[PDB]
Amino acid sequence: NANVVVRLLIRRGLLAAMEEAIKIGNAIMTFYAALIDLLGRCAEAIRIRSILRGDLVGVISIAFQFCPDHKAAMVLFLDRVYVQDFLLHLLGFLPDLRAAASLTDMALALNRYLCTAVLPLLFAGTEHHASLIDSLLHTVKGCSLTKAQRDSIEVCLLSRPSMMQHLLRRLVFDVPLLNKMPLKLLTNHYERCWKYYCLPGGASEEELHLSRKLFWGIFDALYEQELFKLALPCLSAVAGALPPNF
Amino acid sequence: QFLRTDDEVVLQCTATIHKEQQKLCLAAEGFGNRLCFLESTSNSKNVPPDLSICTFVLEQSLSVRALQEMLANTFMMKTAQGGGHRTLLYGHAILLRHSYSGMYLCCLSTSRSSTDKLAFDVGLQEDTTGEACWWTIHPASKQRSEGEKVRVGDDLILVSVSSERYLHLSYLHVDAAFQQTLWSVAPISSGSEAAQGYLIGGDVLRLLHGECLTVPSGEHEQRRTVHYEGGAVSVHARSLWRLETLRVAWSGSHIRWGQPFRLRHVTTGKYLSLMEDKSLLLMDKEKADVKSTAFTFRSSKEKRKEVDGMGTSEIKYGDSVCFIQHIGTGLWLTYQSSIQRKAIMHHEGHMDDGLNLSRSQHEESRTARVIRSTVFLFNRFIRGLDA
């Protein structure tokens, strides 16, 4: 059905005058978002991908400005039709994840783009991890935010590594405010990632001593806190392996 | 009656810009040109259109399954694959080889035009590597259906395989849009051709004198005079003359007596313009009218138009005792007196009106066209450098 639908659509510039009316009435924008959402649902086939394939400048115009549907339509279009470094380089929700810490259209746009910005699983990277480190503790929906937090942990498992050290430092600086459960799971995720990446580690010595002192003071304080303290032993293992809100 | 393998044909639209008979055939220059263009057949009387670089020859007629055979091998086509001559059906996938260059018509991968979003342009290429050379034909008729034979003079739709697009006349490009465009067929010359040693139109040849016809050399005049010269001028590339016929359709038919033909030298382009005032002269491409340039071929000194086929080669190349006569004035080609034996068009002349013919060959033409294209390109280059 996708094949025959796209072909007879091709039987019967557009963006040159179609981004005219963002000022001007909520109809033609959702119209072209509907058309591009339909065309975003069709994965021999290289010849029809060539038919679908210059749209990117219009996408990045849409991705960085009523709003919260058309961006998701273009996100799905790009993720189907159209590498990690160049795909992450075009930060496409940098001002959106910036606006993810300003919490009612926003109150549904946040959960709307929780599951939409999972697709970023697949300097600027430092700023993106910085904005994500504010967005993740900026909601402490529940399950969709936890899925986005697991996505951020897996994004931190990708890449240089001083950004990962700064992110683990940001987790160790935020966990000291609780030493809620979302920050505890995020610091547990950074502890597990540092335990996996401690071989590159073995400045950082005194911060690691402060983190281990905070973990020892939390462990000397005698359930999500039980799971966080059980993961904190992996942070002690990360300290003994690498070296041995705002 | 039908269409088979190796049928030299053309394509022909009828553009109705301002209700005119703005007619055209499709051209492919090549040997320096990777884009295609048109050739006006409307005002063929005053300024006659070029025709040797607008014909095409169907090298192969296949189904879709043979195209997936081309998908199977990572060519050789099993040397036909099939027959034979394989009379063409609708819905087949044909291959258009350009008749002069030997290149194959393909759908390009660029859009060097409007813009006009993502269509493609039309040009030649080298080989049949991939789907970009093959052309499905869909019937442009509610009269006829698909899978059945294609007759002489049918109106159809050309659709490529790779791009899966039309063969569309733009406003003035020819490109691969998403709108239909009729493309008719005129059978030029097929087939075969027919026995060896025959006057058949579209051939380039000479005229023996004992000695041949010639044109003076370059760096001049602008080569607008006619001499004779003996010697090795047959080996020379400036003694080259092409029998250009009058009809568009069936232009590559056989040659009888009687019927007249336009004439044109292969490395100049300035037509053999018998200016009817005095005698033999030479003028440009726009001069060549109906009565002004075409010469009638008479079997003697004494003195049809409608044949829907190849027909009878009256004249071979050996016993070609030919008697060139103009249309209107009735003059005849005789001489006067590095031999400066200048030929004239006279009523009576000598007994040396009876000259014998001699054909040319393939590669001589296949370089002689390159000569004129190269020379005019470098003279445009000289203009740009003097600018």
Side-chain angles (χ1 to χ4, degrees), chain A residues 1-92 95 99-101 104-122 124-125 130 142 148 161 176 182 200-203 217 221 231 233 237 239-241 243-244 246, chain B residues 1-85 87-114 116 119-141 143-221 223-275 278-302 304-387:
Chain A
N1 300 120
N3 193 0
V4 183
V5 160
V6 174
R7 286 178 185 178
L8 96 169
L9 279 172
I10 294 305
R11 289 281 84 81
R12 295 287 176 86
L14 295 175
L15 187 62
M18 194 270 283
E19 287 181 350
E20 177 181 1
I22 292 97
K23 293 180 181 180
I24 296 171
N26 199 356
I28 299 297
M29 195 68 198
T30 62
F31 171 75
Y32 281 94
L35 193 147
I36 206 70
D37 196 3
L38 177 64
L39 293 179
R41 300 289 177 89
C42 49
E44 190 179 2
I46 300 171
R47 191 174 65 189
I48 61 172
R49 289 174 70 93
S50 68
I51 300 169
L52 272 75
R53 288 165 184 261
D55 296 333
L56 298 181
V57 181
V59 171
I60 304 165
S61 72
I62 290 170
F64 289 97
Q65 288 174 357
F66 180 76
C67 291
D69 50 350
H70 325 290
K71 178 177 175 67
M74 293 297 177
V75 159
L76 295 175
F77 174 73
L78 187 69
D79 189 72
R80 295 290 296 275
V81 180
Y82 299 100
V83 185
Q84 288 185 358
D85 297 332
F86 182 73
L87 190 146
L88 287 171
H89 185 76
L90 294 176
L91 291 170
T104 186
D105 291 329
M106 297 178 72
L108 294 175
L110 58 92
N111 293 321
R112 183 179 292 273
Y113 282 88
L114 283 176
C115 65
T116 308
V118 176
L119 285 177
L121 286 176
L122 291 173
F246 180 73
Chain B
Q1 185 57 254
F2 287 100
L3 299 179
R4 295 182 179 92
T5 308
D6 293 332
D7 300 340
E8 184 175 0
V9 297
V10 300
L11 297 178
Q12 189 173 4
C13 286
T14 59
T16 59
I17 295 170
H18 293 283
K19 295 182 179 67
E20 293 174 354
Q21 291 296 105
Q22 181 63 257
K23 290 171 65 66
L24 49 93
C25 64
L26 183 59
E29 175 66 30
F31 280 159
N33 203 169
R34 299 284 82 81
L35 292 174
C36 296
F37 58 92
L38 297 174
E39 181 74 24
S40 67
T41 62
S42 295
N43 194 358
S44 63
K45 296 186 265 76
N46 300 116
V47 185
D50 196 1
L51 196 62
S52 68
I53 47 95
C54 295
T55 58
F56 301 96
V57 170
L58 294 167
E59 290 289 330
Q60 191 172 6
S61 176
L62 299 176
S63 71
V64 184
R65 297 292 91 195
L67 191 144
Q68 277 92 26
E69 188 273 331
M70 304 301 283
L71 267 67
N73 207 167
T74 64
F75 291 97
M76 190 70 200
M77 70 180 179
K78 285 92 175 67
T79 66
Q81 177 178 4
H85 289 171
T87 303
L88 271 71
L89 301 172
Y90 289 106
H92 281 171
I94 64 169
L95 181 60
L96 282 173
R97 180 186 175 184
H98 185 76
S99 66
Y100 169 68
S101 68
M103 299 298 172
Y104 298 101
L105 184 60
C106 74
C107 184
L108 304 173
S109 68
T110 61
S111 69
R112 292 176 66 187
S113 67
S114 66
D116 193 75
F120 287 99
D121 291 331
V122 177
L124 293 172
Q125 70 181 359
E126 301 292 330
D127 292 332
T128 177
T129 66
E131 295 177 354
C133 294
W134 292 95
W135 291 94
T136 59
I137 299 168
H138 291 84
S141 295
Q143 292 82 16
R144 294 178 186 175
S145 176
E146 192 177 2
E148 56 95 20
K149 290 184 182 292
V150 181
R151 279 78 170 269
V152 172
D154 297 341
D155 297 332
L156 52 93
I157 297 298
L158 298 172
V159 174
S160 175
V161 176
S162 64
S163 68
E164 198 176 0
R165 288 177 169 86
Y166 292 106
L167 198 144
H168 173 268
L169 175 60
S170 178
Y171 292 100
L172 295 174
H173 299 285
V174 174
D175 50 359
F178 287 161
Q179 287 182 354
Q180 299 179 358
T181 299
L182 294 173
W183 285 99
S184 66
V185 173
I188 306 301
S189 65
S190 66
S192 63
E193 200 259 333
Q196 295 181 359
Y198 279 168
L199 284 187
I200 292 171
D203 186 76
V204 176
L205 48 85
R206 280 82 176 266
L207 183 63
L208 293 172
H209 188 74
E211 189 173 2
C212 178
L213 182 64
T214 186
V215 169
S217 67
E219 294 178 353
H220 299 294
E221 292 180 352
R223 286 181 178 269
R224 291 178 182 270
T225 62
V226 178
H227 300 286
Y228 284 167
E229 189 179 5
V233 73
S234 67
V235 181
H236 298 173
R238 60 181 172 89
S239 65
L240 288 172
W241 291 97
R242 180 177 176 86
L243 294 171
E244 294 177 354
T245 67
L246 300 176
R247 298 182 298 172
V248 175
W250 289 102
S251 177
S253 67
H254 291 92
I255 299 170
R256 292 175 61 187
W257 295 108
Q259 52 180 357
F261 298 99
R262 291 191 297 272
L263 292 178
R264 183 258 189 89
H265 173 68
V266 190
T267 63
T268 53
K270 299 178 182 180
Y271 283 95
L272 186 59
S273 69
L274 182 57
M275 190 172 179
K278 302 179 181 68
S279 67
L280 184 60
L281 293 175
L282 289 175
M283 289 296 289
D284 286 334
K285 299 176 184 177
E286 291 184 353
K287 195 263 190 298
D289 300 333
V290 174
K291 63 186 178 182
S292 69
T293 182
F295 292 168
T296 64
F297 290 163
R298 297 285 184 268
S299 68
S300 67
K301 192 66 178 293
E302 181 182 2
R304 292 178 186 174
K305 297 177 179 66
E306 298 179 356
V307 283
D308 295 331
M310 294 296 288
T312 63
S313 64
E314 180 66 30
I315 308 160
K316 301 181 77 69
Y317 286 100
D319 293 330
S320 300
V321 182
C322 298
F323 296 92
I324 301 167
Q325 184 187 4
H326 193 77
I327 299 167
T329 62
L331 295 169
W332 300 90
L333 186 61
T334 189
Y335 66 96
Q336 286 181 353
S337 65
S338 65
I339 295 170
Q340 203 178 5
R341 183 181 289 172
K342 181 174 172 64
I344 59 166
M345 289 295 289
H346 191 74
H347 298 281
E348 299 87 3
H350 305 287
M351 190 58 74
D352 285 332
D353 296 329
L355 295 177
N356 192 0
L357 289 170
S358 67
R359 63 181 289 171
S360 67
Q361 292 182 358
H362 291 279
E363 57 90 20
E364 294 170 350
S365 177
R366 290 179 290 169
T367 58
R369 186 63 172 82
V370 185
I371 294 171
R372 68 159 66 251
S373 181
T374 306
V375 166
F376 284 105
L377 181 139
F378 280 120
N379 286 319
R380 182 176 294 169
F381 189 75
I382 288 164
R383 292 181 182 179
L385 265 60
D386 288 330

